[PDB]
Amino acid sequence: VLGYVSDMHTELASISQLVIAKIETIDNDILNKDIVNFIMCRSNLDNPFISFLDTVYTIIDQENYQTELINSLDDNEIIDCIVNKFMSFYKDNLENIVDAIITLKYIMNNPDFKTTYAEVLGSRIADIDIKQVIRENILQLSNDIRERYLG
């Protein structure tokens, strides 16, 4: 656990406090560009929301299993997944937004789907505004994830 001091319980608690502490200092456009980069596999761990997403990704430690799962979906299932998930960015449920982001990341780990969909995802993520859903729910979400995955 490079770049982690204590356990993941402590880590997810601490990073969730940093998120709420720093969220207003981060311009929406920058936040959204960082999100796109996390999905396209260039983390800017400087952004606490990204460090949060990164840590969550690792905890879910499901990358090999998820690659096989995605590799075996057809194009309709992928389009369906992209479109459904994306609406989370317009709604009020933070778990669903984090989920969307991670799921898009797994889809873009497949080079055929990254080629086809990377540009449209980048363009549309640029128009979202999720700061309120983050402020309102990050602490609770962090608690639920610790209780689910790390108990």
Residue numbers in the entry: 13 to 163
Provide the authors' original text about this structure.
VACV protein A49 prevents translocation of NF-κB to the nucleus by sequestering cellular β-TrCP, a protein required for the degradation of the inhibitor of κB. Unexpectedly, the structure showed that A49 possesses a Bcl-2-like fold despite not sharing sequence identity with known cellular or poxvirus Bcl-2 family proteins. The A49 structure shows that A49 lacks a surface groove compatible with binding BH3 peptides and is unable to bind the proapoptotic proteins Bax or Bak.
A truncated form of A49 lacking the N-terminal 12 amino acids (A49 Δ12) was thus expressed and purified. Residues 13–17 adopt three distinct conformations in the 10 A49 Δ12 molecules observed in the two crystal forms (inset) and are disordered in one of the two molecules of A49 Δ12 per asymmetric unit in crystals grown in the sodium malonate condition. Visual inspection of the structures of A49 Δ12 and full-length A49 showed that, in all cases, two molecules of A49 self-associate via an interaction of helices α4 and α6 (the “4-6 face”). In the structure of full-length A49 this interaction is formed by crystallographic 2-fold symmetry, whereas in the structures of A49 Δ12 the interaction is formed by pseudo-2-fold non-crystallographic symmetry. In the structures of A49 Δ12 salt bridges Arg136–Asp92 and Lys103–Asp139 are formed, although these bonds are not symmetric and thus formed only once per pair of A49 molecules. In A49 Δ12 hydrogen bonds are formed between the side chains of Asn88 and Tyr102 and the carbonyl oxygens of Thr128 and Val95, respectively, and between the side chains of Arg136 and Asn96, although again these interactions often occur only once per pair of A49 molecules. Additionally, we observed that A49 crystallized much more readily upon removal of residues 1–12.
